[PDB]
Write a protein that binds this ligand. Structure first.
Ligand SMILES: CCCCCCCCCCCCCCCCCCCC(=O)O[C@H](COC(=O)CCCCCCCCCCCCCC)COP(=O)(O)OCCN
Ligand SMILES: CCCCCCCCCCCCCCCCCCCC(=O)O[C@H](COC(=O)CCCCCCCCCCCCCC)COP(=O)(O)OCCN
Ligand SMILES: CC(C)CCC[C@@H](C)[C@H]1CC[C@H]2[C@@H]3CC=C4C[C@@H](O)CC[C@]4(C)[C@H]3CC[C@]12C
Ligand SMILES: CC(C)CCC[C@@H](C)[C@H]1CC[C@H]2[C@@H]3CC=C4C[C@@H](O)CC[C@]4(C)[C@H]3CC[C@]12C
Ligand SMILES: CC(C)CCC[C@@H](C)[C@H]1CC[C@H]2[C@@H]3CC=C4C[C@@H](O)CC[C@]4(C)[C@H]3CC[C@]12C
Ligand SMILES: CC(C)CCC[C@@H](C)[C@H]1CC[C@H]2[C@@H]3CC=C4C[C@@H](O)CC[C@]4(C)[C@H]3CC[C@]12C
Lengths: 53, 53
């Protein structure tokens, strides 16, 4: 039972890592917008920012 | 008739000038707001300006 759980967890980890490595490699670039709350009416703040992880 | 019209116009002018001289002398200070049109959404513009004639 311990061996089977180790195998199951290793297979789940393999699935997750294979999925993660398959990500677009441009998925680390996302557009972000600080315009909630009182900054919504703020015009000195651009509509959106180019962030990169 | 010309003399009477001159007298009438002079009296009307006296009334107007007496009114004008009686103005508050602070009536030359007025608050003005450039917030029509697309500047309404503009936050870099204060709500109102202190103008003086
Ligand atoms: C043997 C393992 C090698 C597996 C690599 C196969 C996939 C290659 C993917 C494309 C080739 C490449 O250089 O571009 C990036 C992968 O490079 C890489 O990241 C390849 C680097 C591999 C390094 C492995 C060296 C040591 C292996 C184990 C040692 C113990 C793409 O990047 P992406 O995958 O995000 O884009 C989606 C990719 N279809
Ligand atoms: C004789 C004419 C003089 C008439 C003046 C009588 C009204 C005085 C008003 C207050 C006194 C003062 O100095 O304050 C300002 C008037 O001064 C002034 O402006 C007084 C200056 C008068 C100059 C006249 C000198 C020459 C007269 C004709 C020559 C030809 C007020 O200012 P305000 O009237 O706006 O505020 C409402 C005033 N109750
Ligand atoms: C233990 C061994 C079999 C692991 C091998 C890696 C496997 C699990 C990886 C490698 C490539 C991966 C796939 C790559 C792309 C996609 C498309 C996506 O829209 C859904 C997930 C899916 C379908 C992934 C599922 C997991 C996957 C099949
Ligand atoms: C540790 C275990 C739970 C890992 C299991 C794999 C995880 C990491 C991944 C592999 C493929 C992934 C799925 C791929 C595609 C989609 C379709 C999308 O519209 C909603 C998310 C969903 C349904 C993903 C959910 C998470 C997912 C199941
Ligand atoms: C030819 C002679 C009689 C001219 C004398 C000046 C007269 C016409 C001026 C001097 C003071 C003036 C008044 C000063 C203040 C006010 C109050 C305002 O709420 C209405 C106008 C009114 C009532 C003005 C009317 C004109 C007025 C009476
Ligand atoms: C050349 C002629 C027409 C000059 C006549 C006098 C003019 C300059 C002035 C003298 C007093 C003034 C009035 C004084 C007070 C008021 C009340 C206000 O709620 C509306 C304007 C009104 C009704 C003004 C209209 C203009 C007026 C009549």
């Amino acid at each position: 039972s311990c061996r089977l759980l180790t195998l199951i967890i290793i297979l789940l980890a393999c699935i997750y890592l294979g999925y993660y490595f398959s990500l677009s490699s441009l998925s680390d670039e996302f557009v972000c917008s600080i315009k909630s709350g009182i900054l919504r009416a703020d015009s000195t703040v651009p509509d959106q920012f180019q962030c990169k992880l």
